[PDB]
Design a protein around this ligand. Structure first.
Ligand SMILES: N=C1N[C@H]2[C@H](COC(N)=O)NC(=N)N3CC[C@H](O)[C@]23N1
Ligand SMILES: N=C1N[C@H]2[C@H](COC(N)=O)NC(=N)N3CC[C@H](O)[C@]23N1
Ligand SMILES: N=C1N[C@H]2[C@H](COC(N)=O)NC(=N)N3CC[C@H](O)[C@]23N1
Ligand code: FES
Ligand code: FES
Ligand code: FES
Ligand SMILES: [Cl-]
Ligand SMILES: [Cl-]
Ligand SMILES: [Fe+3]
Ligand SMILES: [Fe+3]
Ligand SMILES: [Fe+3]
Lengths: 327, 323, 319
C-alpha cells in the first residue's frame, strides 16, 4: 500500500502532536503504507526519532521494545539501536562488531508548530508556512485527531469546497436561506492552489450574533495541508489543517487553530470545529468512488462554477503526478 | 454486474408497506444501490433510482424529500420525480446542466410488493392468480437476509427430497423418506414441477396428504400451490439478488381457509425457512454449480427438478451467482 | 489455501487429541487448507475416521450430520456413509445402489502417543519417534492447543531459536543478567536437524533437540534432579495460521504436572506475543519493502533450519 508518487514520498507529513511524545516514550504511526515508530530518550529536550517500525534481525516491531538510555531496545533478542539507528549492542555476542546491516530504517523528522513532521524520502520542499504561529496576538488550540475512512485527497477536496456550507453546516457556517455562492477567484501557480477572498453569510458561535458576514481565503502549497484564514470585522481566525495519508483509503485529519481574540473563546472554537468536522466526515465516509476522481459504471462528476476551486484541485493533482488515492 | 436475463427482469426489492408517503428507503439489487422515495401526496408513486448524486457522489438516500423532489444533503441539488435536477442552490438562476440527472429505474407496485427492473422490461411481472380471489386471505412473511447465492436459495426451494430430514415434523416424515416419481418440464412458460404427494400433517390434522406443484416463469420467483382436501395454500416466493453471494427472501402466502390461521401460517413458514437457511449458509461453494478441490455434484432421480433448474440457468445464459 | 509440497502433503500431522474424540462424536479440524471431519461410531474402541468435511451430493459439511450406528448421516437429504466412506443408503431411493461416486474423500489416520495423526497424501514418512513414551518411569501430560496467527514455519523457527531466552523468557528460561550465548553445534543430515547440547546461565538445565519432521520437534532438557522430554507438534492450518501442541514427559514426581503446565503456558504465550507481530508472516528463507534478515553466530540453528527447508523444497508458509 505504498506510493512511488514523489510529491508524496518526498514531502513532509504530520504524524503526531509533540505533546504526545514524552521523553522516554514510544509511540506508533502509519504513513503512506509504512509503519512508523516514534521514540525519545529520557533526557530533557531529547530529539524525536521516527523509524520504520521493524527490527531487521527477525522482523519484530521495534515499538514493542523499550527505551534504555539513548537507545531503543528490541524485545526479542535485545539488540540496541542508538539515536542514529545503528545497532550498538548485540547481547548474545557482546564483543562482536555489529554488521553494517544492523541498522534501523530512519526517516527525516522535524518538530514545527508543535507537530511532528516526517519525510519518508528526500525532502525537496519545506514544511508549509504558518505565519501566525510566531504572532503573540494569536492564541492557539489543537483539535483532536480525526480518523476518516476516505482517501486523503477526498478529505482535502471537501475542505476546499465552499458551496456545501449552507447545507451540511446549516446553522454553523451557512444559512439555508442564503444558499447562493458569491463569485470568487482561484489560482494554481508557484504558490500552489490559492482560493481568493470568498464572502459568505453566517453568524458563528465564536463571535457576536450580528457579526454575520465572514470572508475566507486559503492556500495549499502542499496538496494535503491547507492554510485557511477566516475573517470578520470583529475577529480573525487562521488554521493549519493537515491530512496524514495513512493509506489510499484512510486519513488522519488534524487542525491547529489560531485566533486574534480572547483566550476565553477556546472552548467554543473547539466546539464549532468538532461540530463541522463531524458533519463533513458523515459526507466523506459516504462518497463513492473512494478515490478522488480527477478530471476526464458510475456517472462522471458534474462541475458548476462554484466548483472552480475543487476543479482546480483535481487539475493540480494531475499536474503534480498524483496517482495514490485518486482515480 | 449481472447478465441481461437478470437485468431485464422484474425483482421485488421491498413491500409497499415499507414505503410510506414522504419516506426514503434503500435497497440493493444485482450490486446496484437503490434509493426508493415518495412524496407526501396521497397515493404518490414510488421512485426507484440509483442511490447516487452525480455532482460529488453522495448517496441521495442521505437527503430529504421536499414537496415533489428529492434533495441531496451535500450541496442541496433538487431532483424532480423524473430524476432531473431542477435547482442548483449555489447558482439559483442557472439552468442545471442536462447531465444533472439521477439514474432512474422502472418500478411497479403489484401484489403489495415493489417490483424493479434495472434494464428494459421485456418480461411481465410473474402471475399470481389468487391475488384478487375473494375466497383467499393473504399474509406476508418478514424478509430474510440469506448469506447465499440467490440461485442456491432457489435451488433449495425447488428441492423436494430434503423434507423428511431438515423439515422433519413440518413438511416431511423421517419414516417416509422415499420420493415418489414426478415430472418436470422446462418450456417457454419457464420451469414447472408436476404434482407430487408427500405424507405429512401441517399445523395449518388427519389432513396428512398434500399435493403440491410449482412454476417458475422467472429464475428467482416461484409460484407454489399446496392443496389438501381441506384447504388450498399458494405462495409467491421472491428472491432478491443483492449480489452474487447474498439474497433477500420474501413470501406472499394466500389461503382459502379461515383468516384466523394467519399466525400459525407465519410460524410454519418461519420454522421451515429458518431450517433451510441453516443449510444454505453452510453449502460450499457459495455460488450454484451448473452441470460441470471439491468434487462435482452428484444427481439422483429425485434431483430431476434441481437438475432441470441448472440446465435452465445455462440455457438462459446465467453467469452471475453461479459457478 | 492448499499446497503441493510433498514434504507437507505426504507427511503426518497432529490434528486432535484422542481424548477429544469420544465414541459417537463428531469434531472438526483444518489441515493445509482442507476442512476435516473426524468421527467415531458409538461402539467401544471404534476407529477414528478423518474425511474431507463435505457431502458430494449438494455440498453440505458432513460435520453437521449425526452418527448412526456405524455410519455418518448427512443432515440435508440423509445420505449414509459407512466407516470406509462409501455411501450405503440414499433414503429418497431406498432400494437403489448409490452411484459409485457417492463416497467421502477419506484420509489416512493413526492414533499415536495419544494424538490423532493425519496424512492427506501418500504416507511416505513415518510418524516421528518418541522414545520415552514406552518408558514406565516417565509421566505424561498434554498442553491445551494454541492457535497462533503465524506461519507454522515461523512458529518452528521461534522454537529452534535459543538466544531470545533472556529477553522474552526472563525469569523462566533465561536471565537478563546472562545474555551471552555460548557456542553450540547444529547438524542437518538425513535424520533431519539436530541441535547439540546447550545450557543457559541463570543447577542449570542442559538441553538438545531434534527435528526429523520440519513441523515436529523432540526436545530434551536435563538437570541433576530430573529429565523432561517433549514432542512439540505444529499443525499447519494454512500458510499463515498454526496450532501448537506439546506432549510433555518427565521422570520426577507426578505431582509436578500443574506447575509444568503453567510454566509451559507462560513461555508459550511469551513466544506467541512475538510470533503474532513478526513481519513478513511467512518465514524468509536464505538468499532471496522490508530488508533481508540478519544472522549472527547464535542464529546457527535457525539458519540451518532455513537451509533445510530450501533443500526440502518447502514453498508453503515461507517466502
Ligand atoms: N471544519 C472546518 N472549519 C472551517 C475553517 C475555516 O473557517 C470557515 N469559516 O470556513 N477551517 C478550515 N480549514 N476550513 C476548510 C473548510 C471550511 O472552511 C473549514 N472546515
Ligand atoms: N418454507 C417453505 N414452505 C414450503 C411452501 C409449500 O408451498 C405451499 N404452497 O404451501 N412454500 C414454498 N415456496 N415452498 C418451496 C419449497 C417448500 O415446499 C416450501 N418452502
Ligand atoms: N515453551 C517452551 N518450553 C521449552 C521446553 C523445553 O523442552 C523440555 N524438554 O523441557 N519445550 C520446548 N519444545 N522448547 C523448545 C524451545 C524451548 O526450550 C521450549 N519452549
Ligand atoms: S528481532 Fe530484534 S533483536 Fe532479534
Ligand atoms: S454531491 Fe449532491 S448536490 Fe453535491
Ligand atoms: S447434501 Fe448430503 S445428502 Fe444431499
Ligand atoms: Cl416506472
Ligand atoms: Cl373465512
Ligand atoms: Fe465542510
Ligand atoms: Fe426446505
Ligand atoms: Fe521462546
Amino acid at each position: 500500500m505504498t506510493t512511488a508518487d514523489l510529491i508524496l514520498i518526498n514531502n513532509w507529513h504530520v504524524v503526531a502532536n509533540v505533546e504526545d511524545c514524552k521523553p522516554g516514550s514510544i509511540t506508533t504511526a502509519r504513513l503512506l503504507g509504512v509503519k512508523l515508530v516514534l521514540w525519545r530518550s529520557q533526557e530533557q529536550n531529547s530529539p524525536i526519532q521516527v523509524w520504520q517500525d521493524y527490527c531487521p534481525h527477525r522482523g519484530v516491531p521495534l515499538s514493542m521494545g523499550e527505551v534504555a538510555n539513548n537507545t531503543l531496545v528490541c524485545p526479542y533478542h535485545g539488540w540496541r539501536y542508538n539515536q542514529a539507528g545503528k545497532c550498538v549492542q548485540i547481547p548474545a555476542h557482546p564483543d562482536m562488531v555489529p554488521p553494517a546491516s544492523a541498522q534501523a530504517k530512519t526517516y527525516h523528522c522535524q518538530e514545527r508548530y508543535g507537530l511532528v513532521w516526517v519525510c519518508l524520502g528526500n525532502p525537496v520542499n519545506d514544511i508549509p508556512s504558518f505565519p501566525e504561529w510566531d504572532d503573540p496576538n494569536y492564541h492557539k488550540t489543537y483539535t483532536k485527531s480525526y480518523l476518516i475512512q476516505a482517501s486523503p485527497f477526498r478529505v482535502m477536496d471537501n475542505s476546499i469546497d465552499v458551496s456545501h456550507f449552507p447545507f451540511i453546516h446549516d446553522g454553523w457556517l451557512g444559512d439555508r436561506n442564503y444558499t447562493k455562492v458569491e463569485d470568487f477567484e482561484v489560482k494554481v501557480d508557484k504558490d500552489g492552489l490559492t482560493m481568493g477572498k470568498y464572502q459568505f453569510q453566517t453568524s458563528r458561535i465564536v463571535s457576536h450574533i450580528e457579526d454575520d458576514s465572514w470572508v475566507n481565503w486559503f492556500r495549499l502549497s502542499h496538496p494535503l495541508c491547507q492554510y485557511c484564514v477566516s475573517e470578520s470585522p470583529e475577529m480573525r481566525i487562521v488554521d493549519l489543517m493537515t491530512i496524514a495519508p495513512i493509506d489510499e483509503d484512510n486519513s488522519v485529519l488534524r487542525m491547529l487553530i489560531m485566533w486574534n481574540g480572547s483566550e476565553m473563546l477556546e472552548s467554543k472554537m473547539l466546539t464549532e470545529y468538532d461540530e463541522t468536522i463531524e458533519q463533513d466526515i458523515r459526507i466523506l465516509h459516504s462518497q463513492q468512488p473512494a478515490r478522488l476522481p480527477l478530471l476526464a459504471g458510475l456517472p462522471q462528476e458534474i462541475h458548476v462554477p462554484s466548483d472552480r476551486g475543487t476543479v482546480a484541485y483535481r487539475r493540480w493533482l494531475k499536474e503534480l503526478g498524483v496517482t495514490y488515492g485518486v482515480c
